[PDB]
Amino acid sequence: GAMCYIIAKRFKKSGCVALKAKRGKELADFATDLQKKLGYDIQIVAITRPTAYGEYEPYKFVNSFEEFSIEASRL
Template sequence: MCYLIAKERDAHGCYALKTRHSKHLAELKRELNEAVGYKGVQLVTISRPTAYGEYAPYHFVDTEQEFRVLVKGLRQE
């Protein structure tokens, strides 16, 4: 188990999706990086949120679809 984190570089807090290490996770990160990486959104995979206070507060999402929508909505221009 791991968490995929999406954080705007200059903002407090992040979105977090509980997931598993897999090829699908790598593809999801690649897709989202292509969509928002150049806009200053950082995507990171972490083992447990309590160990990474720099990303707090965490907004945990329930589904991958919700995570995609929220992340793609960051830094809209």
């Protein structure tokens, strides 16, 4: 089905962590929780397509919520 990409990026630091994910309650609750833990210097955003958002280049693609959490916390 249709997928989006959840993105983590530190303001004023180029590049992001990206995970292809399904929009829904599970993703939304994961993102809200992760944003709280990471603090306000990190942005958790959702985009449709990486090619539409050059502001997040380069994209460090990951393959799980666990890897996304770990890599986002390293920004």
